């Protein structure tokens, strides 16, 4: 009755120095410090920078290969991203200005990948905008997922708004960063801890009216981070 | 703030 | 620091004798029993069955002039529907065979109208299928919602896929209220409380595979069903 | 079952 994983795995990737768009700073100390908290929960950890299109796609399929039945996958991005109908996108560094969804990760798409493994648990901690993008000309039409009730989205912010770091960042972390480090510890189901972070974000100053958590989950069973993977000794 |  | 309501208003809709698409048995009983446990928790709460898109319009409108300031408004419903680039549809009794958009009611334009009246809690629980229509040629492009960090969705199921009642039902629940029902007077934060019930159904033999509840919410303040009215004695 |  103790939820198991049967491997804990995570990929972590922090865009930085785009070509053609504006520079951000603070991914480099986001990934750092989930690198370190992901560690301390036994995962093992893939943590790039500065990801151009296809050393993302090669990254992506580096972490499917270690993902298979009942693994809890996790991925982590940190960067430019967008939203078209629903769908996210993850923006590489060497994406043009202006760029369409082919320039970029459809983060649905990997998840249908992860599924096709099998995995016990599938996270999705995007820490990106998540507005539409106009030159974006395309439509998705994907095949329905399965339902596996073991998914959950901790969105740094809402569909159609920002996501923030501080301005000319140094040493801060981003904002999602910032109040998901202090709670990421907690042996709690993962939607549950992502609420308590949601409540922890809501009383910002700085980001009220403009960036707030959002978490979607069908994840049934309770699940956590902290799960004891099969066969060690807990 | 700075936004991604 | 207890979260209080300055209102709670909740509007509730269960279609069943469609003219065009398969007839449901289930959602009266559905909208009966939510009726009873809201009732309990202190909502004034509008119930109706079997609306014609005309019916539905005036309903939300009526529902929508209730609201204001500070207001917890919840919107239940039960029936046919549709999702399609992530915008949810609810389907009238008089949808014609087949129909597009604009037979229907988008849900996301009402969570605009409610964000309007400045709503203190916005819940939605859509007890209907989330598979794509096909005949509906058009497109959202709707404007991006403000970041009120106080939204919660309970899906009865997962986008592309459906959601269920019992065949032949007479007088059981659909899948959805079987589990809501044995929660719901919780007093705890609604997202906590919508995922216990995530957890329940998904011991559920009969659906396992084909429906699981998922929540999506930027819920921050710790808000609940059972918060006192404003100005009343608890 | 019968869908919704």
Known sequence: D???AKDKVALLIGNMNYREHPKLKAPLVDVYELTNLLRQLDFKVVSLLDLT?????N?????????????????YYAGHGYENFGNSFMVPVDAPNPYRSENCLCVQNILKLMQEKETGLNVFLLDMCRKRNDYDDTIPIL?????????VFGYATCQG???????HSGLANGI????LKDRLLEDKKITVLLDEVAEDMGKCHLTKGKQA???RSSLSEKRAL????????? | VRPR
């Open chain 1, 2 to 4: 103790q939820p198991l």
């Open chain 1, 53 to 57: 299109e296809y050393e993302m796609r």
């Open chain 1, 59 to 75: 990254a992506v399929d580096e972490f499917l290969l270690l993902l298979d039945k009942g693994v809890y996958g996790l991925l």
């Open chain 1, 143 to 151: 095949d329905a997922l399965k339902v596996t009730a073991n998914i």
């Open chain 1, 161 to 167: 708004a920002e996501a923030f770091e501080i301005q």
């Open chain 1, 176 to 179: 999602f960063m910032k109040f």
């Open chain 1, 213 to 215: 958590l959002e978490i």
């Open chain 1, 226 to 234: 902290t799960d004891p993977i099969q066969g060690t000794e807990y």
